[PDB]
């Protein structure tokens, strides 16, 4: 069992992030463009899917 504040701290690094639709890169939650060249710094981003 994990209490909610520690769960939020873990989720800040593990779940609250953006994923590039082209190259699956793990980006910070406020990202607008991917940081990686192989997708061409695309702006096709989606939220990381939740366990809910």
């Amino acid at each position: 069992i994990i209490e909610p504040s520690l769960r939020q701290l873990a989720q800040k690094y593990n779940c609250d992030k953006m994923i590039c639709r082209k190259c699956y890169a793990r980006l910070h939650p406020r990202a607008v463009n991917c940081r990686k060249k192989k997708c061409g710094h695309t702006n096709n981003l989606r939220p990381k899917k939740k366990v809910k």
């Binding site: 069992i1 994990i2 520690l6 701290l9 873990a10 800040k12 593990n14 939740k50």
Partner: protein, 190 residues
Amino acid sequence: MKTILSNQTVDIPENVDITLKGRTVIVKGPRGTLRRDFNHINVELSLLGKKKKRLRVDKWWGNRKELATVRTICSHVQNMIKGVTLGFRYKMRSVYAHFPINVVIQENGSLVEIRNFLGEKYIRRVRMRPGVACSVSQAQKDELILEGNDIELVSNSAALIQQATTVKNKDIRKFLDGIYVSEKGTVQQA
């Protein structure tokens, strides 16, 4: 476009002094001395007065990419001032669902042993960067305190600790176990 001049000034507190050796900044304060050279950036560093100790960073005829470096240098120098005056303290929390994470701090805080991460028999030995001391907090039950003068060294040590306890071949959205940087602050709170 080439901008004629881009400058930025950092104020220096009275208890700390700064010496320039070309583009090498030596910041001596109550807690120690932080020395860092910026020879990879073509800027001009100057100390202004004998009264309030302003440090000016100047870039002449720079395009956008090298105008971006002036505030980078200024922020680095401010971090050096902050480190030698108040220091840097990173508080990390170890979170776990079933297996408690046992952390043992070896000699002088320079080595960290993680024992029971996710119940595995492997022992994680993480060596701190020089000048960074790790300790087990007496205020919280699962808390590591990393204290030092260099923000990059302290944060690199914290990142090493965080990345050592990485869940593999499992859903990381479910297996949230590990040591994570809870907060970043200073020592002495002044």
